[PDB]
Structures are given as structure tokens and as C-alpha cells.
């Protein structure tokens, strides 16, 4: 939602709809001035939000010789239902393998 302003008073515009033509139009509240709208959105929020996954430490990896591979529940495109996969938290791993 970008703010819009009046061309006579340069105050903030107030959206206001009369159902004579089924049309939205921005109106000013200062003098009397009105004009026709262009956009659609009356309000926009983008509310907010603009590891705690379980780890093991006793399994072989592919690249690094570590025990860790974090496992979370997934349902992949070639998988089925509940599946587990193992990629090490080391960035040397980079590889996702099935059991």
C-alpha cells in the first residue's frame, strides 16, 4: 500500500466506494476533491518474520568423516509418505542419500 495524496490540498487520501457504477475511487477528506482509483489493494500488512531439528552422531557421511546427519521428516516427489534423509551439517557434504 503506497500512500496517495490530493492534488488540491496535498493531504492523505481516504478510499471510498459508492456502488453506482461498481467502481473504487480515492477521495480526500479536507476540501471535497475526489478522483478515480487505479490499483486494487486497500490494505497491505506483511505481518512479521520478514537448528531445532534432531541430530544423530553415529552414522557415516559421504565426504567428511563425521558421525552427524540431521534427520527431518520429508515427503519428496520420488518418495512416499514418511521418509528420512541424511545430509551432514558440514557444508562439505552437499549430498542427499536414501537409506
Amino acid at each position: 500500500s503506497t500512500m496517495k495524496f490530493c492534488r488540491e490540498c496535498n493531504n492523505i487520501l481516504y478510499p471510498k466506494e459508492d456502488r453506482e457504477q461498481s467502481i473504487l475511487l480515492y477521495a480526500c477528506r479536507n476540501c471535497d476533491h475526489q478522483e478515480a482509483a487505479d490499483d486494487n489493494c486497500v490494505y497491505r500488512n506483511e505481518v512479521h518474520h520478514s537448528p531445532t531439528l534432531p541430530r544423530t552422531k553415529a552414522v557415516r557421511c559421504a565426504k567428511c568423516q563425521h558421525g552427524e546427519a540431521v534427520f527431518f521428516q520429508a515427503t519428496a516427489r520420488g518418495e512416499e509418505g514418511m521418509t528420512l534423509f541424511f545430509v551432514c551439517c558440514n557444508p562439505n557434504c552437499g549430498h542427499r542419500w536414501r537409506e
Binding site: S1, T2, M3, I12, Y43, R44, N45
Partner: peptide, 14 residues
């Protein structure tokens, strides 16, 4: 500009 929460705050102020 943008960051709706700010402009929502100022239109609520008016």
C-alpha cells in the same frame, strides 16, 4: 518507502 508497517503506523497516526 514500503515496509508497510511504517506507513500503516503513520496512517493510523493521522
Amino acid at each position: 518507502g514500503g515496509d508497510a508497517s511504517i506507513t500503516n503506523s503513520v496512517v493510523a497516526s493521522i
